[PDB]
Write a protein that binds this ligand. Structure first.
Ligand SMILES: Nc1ncnc2c1ncn2[C@@H]1O[C@H](CSCC[C@H](N)C(=O)O)[C@@H](O)[C@H]1O
Ligand SMILES: O=c1[nH]cnc2c(O)cc(Br)cc12
Ligand SMILES: [Mg+2]
Length: 214
C-alpha cells in the first residue's frame, strides 16, 4: 500500500466518475488533510487554468505526471480535438495517472509516455505525430528543467509563441532555468507568485508531567 495508491482509492471511493472537477477536489482534500503530496495543487492550479484559458492550446506536453492531478486539471480545459502528452519516469505513477484519467473520463484526450523525458523528447515527432508544441508544463525534477528546455529547442518542438509554464521555480527552486530563460532573448518571461501546495503543516507540543520515580 503506497501513498499514491491511497490517493487513487480515495478518488475511486469519493469522487464522481466522469467529473474532473470532483476528481481534483478529492485529491486536494486528501492531500491537505491526510498526506502531503507533490500535486501542483489548487492555488497554482487556478493560475494554470487561467493561462490555459488564455492560450487555448491544441497540443500540450507535461513533464511529470505523478498521480495525474495536473493532467486532469489541464485536459478538462482542452477544446475538442486537442491533445495532452504527459511524460512519467516512474511506472507505478504512470499506471496511477492512467487510472485517474480513466476515472475522470479524460482518457481520450491524454496519452501517457513511460520513460525519462530526456529519452522521450527526441521520440515525439516520429512516434506521436507532433510538429510543434503549443504549451509545455514543466513539473518533473528541478535539475531537468534547463536541459529539457534545450532539448525541446534542439529537436524543433518549439515555435514562436510556444508557452512554457514551470512549477516550483522558487521551491524547491530552479535557479539555472530561471536565469537562463529570463536572460535569453529567445524567451519572454512572466512570474506568477503563489504558494507551495498543501503547507498547513501539523505539529504539536507535548506536555509531560513528572510523577516521580517507580
Ligand atoms: N526525467 C523525468 N522524466 C519524466 N518524469 C520524471 C522525470 N523526473 C522525475 N519525473 C517524475 O516527475 C513527477 C514529479 S511530481 C508531478 C506532479 C504533477 N505534475 C501534478 O501536479 O499532479 C514524478 O511522478 C516523477 O517520477
Ligand atoms: O520534485 C518535485 N517535482 C514536481 N513538483 C514538486 C513540488 O510541486 C513540490 C516539491 Br517539494 C517537489 C516537487
Ligand atoms: Mg510541482
Amino acid at each position: 500500500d503506497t501513498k499514491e495508491q491511497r490517493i487513487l482509492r480515495y478518488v475511486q471511493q469519493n469522487a464522481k466518475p466522469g467529473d474532473p472537477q470532483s476528481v481534483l477536489e478529492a485529491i486536494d482534500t486528501y492531500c491537505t488533510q491526510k498526506e502531503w503530496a507533490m500535486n501542483v495543487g489548487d492555488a497554482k492550479g487556478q493560475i494554470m487554468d487561467a493561462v490555459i484559458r488564455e492560450y487555448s492550446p491544441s497540443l500540450v506536453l507535461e513533464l511529470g505526471a505523478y498521480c495525474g492531478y495536473s493532467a486532469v486539471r489541464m485536459a478538462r480545459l482542452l477544446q475538442p480535438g486537442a491533445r495532452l502528452l504527459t511524460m512519467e519516469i516512474n511506472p507505478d505513477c504512470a499506471a496511477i495517472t492512467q487510472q485517474m484519467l480513466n476515472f475522470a473520463g479524460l482518457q481520450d484526450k491524454v496519452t501517457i509516455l513511460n520513460g525519462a523525458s530526456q529519452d522521450l523528447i527526441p521520440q515525439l515527432k516520429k512516434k506521436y505525430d507532433v510538429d510543434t508544441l503549443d504549451m509545455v508544463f514543466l513539473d518533473h525534477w528541478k535539475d531537468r528543467y534547463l536541459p529539457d528546455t534545450l532539448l525541446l529547442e534542439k529537436c524543433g518542438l518549439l515555435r514562436k509563441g510556444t508557452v512554457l509554464l514551470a512549477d516550483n521555480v522558487i521551491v524547491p527552486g530552479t535557479p539555472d532555468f530561471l536565469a537562463y530563460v529570463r536572460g535569453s532573448s529567445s524567451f519572454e518571461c512572466t512570474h506568477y507568485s503563489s504558494y507551495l501546495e498543501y503547507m498547513k503543516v501539523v505539529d504539536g507540543l507535548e506536555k509531560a508531567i513528572y510523577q516521580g520515580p517507580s
